[PDB]
Amino acid sequence: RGNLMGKRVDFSARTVISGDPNLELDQVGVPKSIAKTLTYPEVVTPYNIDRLTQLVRNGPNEHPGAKYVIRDSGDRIDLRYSKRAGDIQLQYGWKVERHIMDNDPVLFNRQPSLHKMSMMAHRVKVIPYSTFRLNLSVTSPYNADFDGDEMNLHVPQSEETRAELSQLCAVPLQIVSPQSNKPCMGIVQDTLCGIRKLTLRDTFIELDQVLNMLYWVPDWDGVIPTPAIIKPKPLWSGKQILSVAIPNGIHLQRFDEGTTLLSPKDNGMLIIDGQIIFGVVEKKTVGSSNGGLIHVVTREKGPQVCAKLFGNIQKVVNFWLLHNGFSTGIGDTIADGPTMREITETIAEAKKKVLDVTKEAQANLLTAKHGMTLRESFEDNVVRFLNEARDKAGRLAEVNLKDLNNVKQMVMAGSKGSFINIAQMSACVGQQSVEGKRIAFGFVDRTLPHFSKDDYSPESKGFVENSYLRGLTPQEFFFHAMGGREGLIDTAVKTAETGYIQRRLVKALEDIMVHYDNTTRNSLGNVIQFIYGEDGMDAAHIEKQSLDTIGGSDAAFEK
């Protein structure tokens, strides 16, 4: 395992990673010191002799340079020590171990490598500073973030090895994945957030900014689109300027809930010939979604065009947002005086439901359903009332939040946060659970020595009435910490356990491959499937389609 199946290798490099709005999807930012340590062995041909001479002349310390010149016999000339290091008249057939240069294919990776998308080929872009820079929309396959993460780079040392990386492993080739027959890369964070904000019917742009936004798109035709508005001032909509980033012959149709071709809510999506007709652009259109812009553009225009679409959208949106601004403060967690009153009463009614049920259980009136205990029946009821309360209180909070609420804004775009988050920060944290039950009696007949014995009340068994805004009481604080711990303990287990599963799965199926007869066979030549997937289709070239003859009435079918 440690020496044959895996081993430490030369032409490898490692560092802390950083994001780069100004980097192409298929690129990787290489620190100059790394580009200078890592080399490629280039043969001296008439097609490169001039460039190689200059690189040898630059030597190992100036960037587009080289260390080592290998001649016939195989003798390595050390460019940092040789007395003839400034002489060297190259000959064809010699090799120059040149520095890693812009556009070289490199294998970029983040451990754990659970995916083939965890190990992809990028185009080198030599940069100042000591981190590896990467396009934000490649963060997901690697499952990378910039909180201290490190990544590894591998350098192909052969022409065929570079072809393998560029023709099989390249980032654009991986956009649409066979794992879930859909893209594994999409518009995220700031870009996902600003693309929504830009797309509002209300969002309008003036000439000055429009011109700058248009120029920010490298594939731009140079033609200024006619402004949506031509009356007191030419005014372009956000949808208009973002459509410049979308190539022609791109068609997309959606329909969410109330979408009606006149799209009252500006929901759904309609793109004709790469021009957005209606529909606020968010996660459903521009994320890792099944039939979105990205799945469509890859299939329609191709992987190379799709990888440009990442940058193009990033460039416009990042610029517009840089100029617009986006924040979040304590004020975004605050709901109305009246909302709070309603939340407060929502909880007190839940508190009474639990009392009534308790009083009833204690009177021997509560009958247990077939299959479950009277006490199990009680616990089930209490927890429902208590969960209902958190959900009802939370929904009360969410409704009160204005469209200008920054938390609500991030939820609408689908960039960060869900309902729970709003509810727990603004309304009520809710019931704490350990081993799927409410807080257990760790002391005799009580959860804490601040309670009396035999107390089944919400507060007693871990119900956090307060929100993170209001703040938690010591009892509530401790119980939340108990619930919290169960999470960290299984996180720690559901990593070492899943890692072992993954190994076993990989080892058992290692040798299964598609043969020249469309058959699925192991190393013995034994048949697993007669046709791969039963249809002999590649998973990355497949998408969810409606079978129109199956549904509807017999009359509808006839019509």
Partner DNA sequence: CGATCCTCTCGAT
Task: Find out whether 208 is annotated in a ligand binding site.
Answer: no
Surface-to-core class of residue 176, CB atoms within 10 Å of its CB (0-12 exposed, 13-18 middle, 19+ buried): buried
Asked if 83 is part of the footprint of another protein (rule: CB under 8 A), the reply reads no
Spatial CB neighbours of 239, under 8 Å, sequence gap ≥ 6: 199, 203, 276, 278, 281
Cβ 502 to DNA, closest distance in Å? 8
**144-183 binders of Mg ion (CB under 5 A):** 145, 147, 149
Q: Where are the beta strands (DSSP E) in 44-104?
A: 66-70, 76-77, 95-99
To RNA, the closest distance from the beta carbon of 143 in angstroms equals 8
For residue 125, which amino acid is it?
Answer: K
Residues in CB range of 6: below 8 A, 6 or more apart: none
Q: Which of 39, 137, 139, 259 binds another protein (CB under 8 A)?
A: 39
Contact 78, 69 (CB under 8 A): no
Q: Which residues in the 389-448 window bind another protein by CB under 8 A? A: 403-404, 406-407, 410-411, 415-418, 421, 424-425, 433-436, 439-444, 447-448
| Residue range at the interface with another protein (CB under 8 A); choices 77-85, 257-265, 356-364, 390-398 | 257-265
CB 252 within 8 A of CB 293: yes
Cα 453–454–457 angle (5° rounding)? 110
Q: In the complex, which residues of this chain contact DNA (CB under 7 A)?
A: 6, 8, 14, 111-112, 150, 495-496, 499-500, 503
Asked if residue 147 belongs to a known ligand binding site, the reply is: yes
Q: Does 149 bind RNA (CB under 7 A)?
A: yes
Residues 482-511 interacting with another protein (rule: CB under 8 A): 482-495, 497-499, 501-511
Q: Applying CB under 7 A, does 147 fall inside the site for RNA?
A: yes
CB-based burial of residue 329 (10 Å sphere; 0-12 exposed, 13-18 middle, 19+ buried)? exposed
Judged by beta carbon distances under 5 to 8 A according to partner kind, the member of DNA, another protein, RNA, none in contact with residue 179 is another protein
Q: Could you tell me the smallest distance in angstroms from the CB atom of residue 283 to another protein? A: 13
305 part of the interface to another protein, by CB under 8 A: no
Q: CA neighbours within 13 Å on the CB side: how many for 38?
A: 27
Choose the stretch contacting another protein; rule: CB under 8 A; options: 77-85, 356-364, 371-379, 391-399. 371-379
DSSP string covering 251-279: -EE---SS--SS-TTS-S-EEETTEEEE-
CA-CA-CA-CA torsion for 368, 369, 372, 374, nearest 10 degrees? -10
Residue closer to DNA by CB (options 111, 457) is: 111
Nearest residue (CB) to RNA, 53 versus 152: 152
Point out which residues pair with 15 in neighbouring strands. Answer: 151
- Smallest separation (angstroms) from RNA to the CB of 147: 5
Give 15 or 243: the residue with its C-beta nearer to DNA.
Answer: 15
Tell me: does residue 491 bind Mg ion (CB under 5 A). no
Of residues 106 through 145, those in contact with Mg ion by CB under 5 A are 145
8 A C-beta contact, residue 56 and residue 89: no
Q: What are phi and psi of 175, to 5 degrees?
A: -40, -60
Q: Judged by CB under 8 A, does residue 113 bind another protein?
A: yes
Min CB(478)–RNA separation in Å: 23
CB nearer to DNA: give 123 or 154: 154
Write out the two tokens for 374: 């009277």
* Cα 106 from Cα 153, distance rounded (Å): 7
- From candidates 73, 74, 87, 223, binder to another protein by CB under 8 A: 223
Q: Pick from 332, 327, 379, 372: which is nearest to 354 by CA? A: 379
Q: Check residue 490 and report its DSSP letter.
A: H
How far is Cα 37 from Cα 60, in angstroms, rounded to an integer? 8
Angle between helix 303-324 and helix 207-215 axes, rounded to 10 deg: 150
**What is the C-alpha separation between 233 and 215, in angstroms, rounded?**
21
Q: Identify the sign of the CA torsion 440, 442, 445, 446.
A: negative
| Choices 40-48, 121-129, 140-148, 374-382 (CB under 7 A): range interacting with RNA | 140-148
Q: In whole angstroms, what is the distance from residue 193 CA to residue 187 CA?
A: 9
Residues in 132-151 that interact with another protein by CB under 8 A: 136, 146-148, 150
> In this chain, which stretch among 83-91, 330-338, 355-363, 389-397 interacts with another protein, using CB under 8 A?
330-338
The rounded distance, in Å, linking the Cα atoms of 266 and 257 is: 11
Q: Which of 2, 128, 148, 222 binds RNA (CB under 7 A)?
A: 148
CB of residue 18 to RNA, shortest distance in Å: 13
x-marked contacts with RNA along 100-119 as a string, rule CB under 7 A = -----------xx-------
Min dist. Cβ of residue 501 to DNA (A): 9
Binding span for RNA by CB under 7 A among 148-156, 173-181, 414-422, 550-558: 148-156
Sign of the Cα torsion 265, 329, 485, 352 reads negative
- Residue 440 binds which entry of another protein, Mg ion, RNA, none, CB below 5-8 Å type-dependent: another protein
Q: What residues make contact with Mg ion under the rule CB under 5 A? A: 145, 147, 149
Q: What residues make contact with RNA under the rule CB under 7 A? A: 111-112, 145, 147-150
Binding-site residue ranges:
145, 147, 149
Binding-site residue ranges for Mg(2+):
145, 147, 149
